[PDB]
Design a protein around this ligand. Structure first.
Ligand SMILES: Cc1ccc(NS(=O)(=O)CCN)cc1F
Lengths: 300, 237
């Protein structure tokens, strides 16, 4: 069980840790988060009381170093940092654990929600989407635009998701215009899976990371990437049977976890209706379709 | 984006453009089977690709053999059209390729856009105008060449005949749309108007009659009367 200690909490903030959140008051005696399950990536995120603009946060894996949070009053945010002196870090964390100044990551034992939402997400791939190599953790916020968005403006602060564009030469083989546009199996299986991602696990990882950036930060270009990767599979007549089963499970927990009140902005009516009712895989997502119909029938 | 009455004059500027109409690409004759079911039989069709400025019409004849063994013909028709327009642009010299292609039906946008990915600098636009290009098969010489074709074939025409010698393209296009709209609303009456006076002939190398300027006025008046008529006959006014 690992720990992200905090130097202080000088400004009032709603702190998110994976799918949980809790309110910290200005100068409340708060010194971090303990009992964080080893073996998954995590995201700690922030929404300031005063200016709800800019949700921002850090993707990290505790196996990759000792990380803490200190508020920077010049840049005005809670920054993640890596303390290299591991003995100073045990002493600091033990002091705060003894003074009971930390909240406990509140995992219910039956609860596999985070494992299911992050099944294929790996830090090493996060760090290639979010390029900041002098840090082991990855910063994301509401406003960061994606590489594809910047094509259609600061490259350093971009989300380098895999570009997907159904009306592009990458996607459409010369002489197979109709075939490949109405049945994206070529784009999915040869171009993307075999060519770019190497395997379905990398593809699912990016899809899951896009959804989480969309849900936790309201990052609009991530939501675009999530839907595009869903549509590419649904629009493929020919998909490995294991990929389909997994997708159904992946999406089910994304829709399960989504806040009911944010459905109006995070779900693309056109993509979902097409995927569940018109696409090739309209019959291949029983769990996702059952939950979508019971929970968000208005959108459909 | 879309072409409408506000930017109508763009059709006659000096940027090369083409209209593409796909209405007559896939054409059928629904009939009863011996078992008393219903079956279509396809007939030759055509793509109507028009330069509104010059009047150059590239009439691509769609031979019924292109449907044999094919499923979902109405959808295939759109991609077929797109492929043939694309093949046509590629056949043309660079200085002759269009800068825009305007489709008359929005369903053609994606098919064409996909077939034209090699030509990023050519804009594919819809239009809000309800243009009457479907009636192109009411022009006898066009209908004739389509029905006689025994293989795929491209036939070049000027749909304005020689009219640009005497009038502008704006006016030539207006006359053309008025003739076609008339043929679309009442083909019989329209053809009667055009061919009533045996002394007015169609030159071997033309599609329409050799009307003097005053006779074109008379004719144009008769087509507008017919369109108002059928509009009354239709709606009772
Ligand atoms: C967790 C935690 C770990 C290390 C440090 N700081 S240091 O040793 O003073 C180095 C400060 N740069 C502060 C902390 F709050």
């Amino acid at each position: 069980m690992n720990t992200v200690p905090f130097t202080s909490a000088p400004i009032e903030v709603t702190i998110g840790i994976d799918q949980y959140s809790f309110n910290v008051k200005e100068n409340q005696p708060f010194h971090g988060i303990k009992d964080i399950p080893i073996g998954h990536v995590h995201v700690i995120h922030f929404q300031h009381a005063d200016n709800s603009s800019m949700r921002y946060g850090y993707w990290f894996d505790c196996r990759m170093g000792n990380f803490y949070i200190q508020y920077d009053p010049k840049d005005g945010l809670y920054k993640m940092m890596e303390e290299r002196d591991g003995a100073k870090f045990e002493n600091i964390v033990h002091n705060f654990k003894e003074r009971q100044m930390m909240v406990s990551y509140p995992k219910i034992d039956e609860d596999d929600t985070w494992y299911n939402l992050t099944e294929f997400v790996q830090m090493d791939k996060i760090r290639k989407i979010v390029r900041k190599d002098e840090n082991q953790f990855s910063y994301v916020d509401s406003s960061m635009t994606t590489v594809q968005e910047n094509e259609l403006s600061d490259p350093a602060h971009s989300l380098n998701y895999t570009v997907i564009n159904f009306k592009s030469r990458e996607a459409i083989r010369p002489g197979h215009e109709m075939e490949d546009f109405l049945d994206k199996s070529y784009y999915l299986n040869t171009v993307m899976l075999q060519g770019i991602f190497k395997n379905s696990s990398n593809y699912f990882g990016e899809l899951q990371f896009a959804f989480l950036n969309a849900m936790f930060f309201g990052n609009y270009g991530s939501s675009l990437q999530w839907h595009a990767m869903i549509e590419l599979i649904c629009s493929s007549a020919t998909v490995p049977k294991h990929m389909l089963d997994k997708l159904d499970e992946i999406l089910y927990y994304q829709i399960k976890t989504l806040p009911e009140q944010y459905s109006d902005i995070l779900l693309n009516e056109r993509v979902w209706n097409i995927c569940l009712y018109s696409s090739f895989q309209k019959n291949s997502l029983h769990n996702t379709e059952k939950i979508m119909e019971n929970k968000y029938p208005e959108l459909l | 984006g879309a072409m409408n009455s506000s930017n109508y004059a763009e059709l006659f500027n000096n940027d090369i453009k083409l209209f593409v109409d796909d209405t007559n690409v896939y054409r059928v004759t629904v009939h009863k089977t011996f078992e008393g079911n219903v079956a279509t039989k396809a007939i030759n069709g055509c793509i109507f690709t028009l330069n509104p400025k010059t009047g150059h019409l590239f009439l691509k004849i769609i031979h019924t053999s292109v449907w044999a063994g094919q499923k979902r013909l109405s959808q295939l028709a759109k991609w077929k059209t797109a492929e043939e327009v694309s093949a046509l642009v590629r056949s043309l010299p660079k200085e002759e390729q269009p800068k825009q292609i305007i489709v008359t039906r929005k369903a053609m946008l994606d098919p064409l856009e996909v077939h034209m990915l090699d030509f990023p600098n050519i804009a594919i636009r819809p239009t809000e105008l309800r243009l009457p290009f479907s009636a192109a098969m009411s022009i006898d010489k066009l209908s004739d060449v389509v029905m006689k074709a025994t293989e795929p074939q491209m036939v070049l025409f000027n749909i304005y005949d020689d009219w640009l010698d005497r009038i502008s393209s704006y006016t030539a296009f207006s006359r053309l749309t008025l003739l076609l709209r008339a043929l679309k609303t009442n083909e019989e009456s329209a053809k009667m108007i055009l061919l009533s006076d045996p002394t007015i002939t169609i030159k071997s190398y033309h599609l329409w009659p050799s009307f003097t300027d005053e006779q074109w006025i008379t004719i144009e008046s008769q087509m507008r009367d017919l369109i108002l008529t059928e509009y009354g006959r239709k709606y009772n006014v």
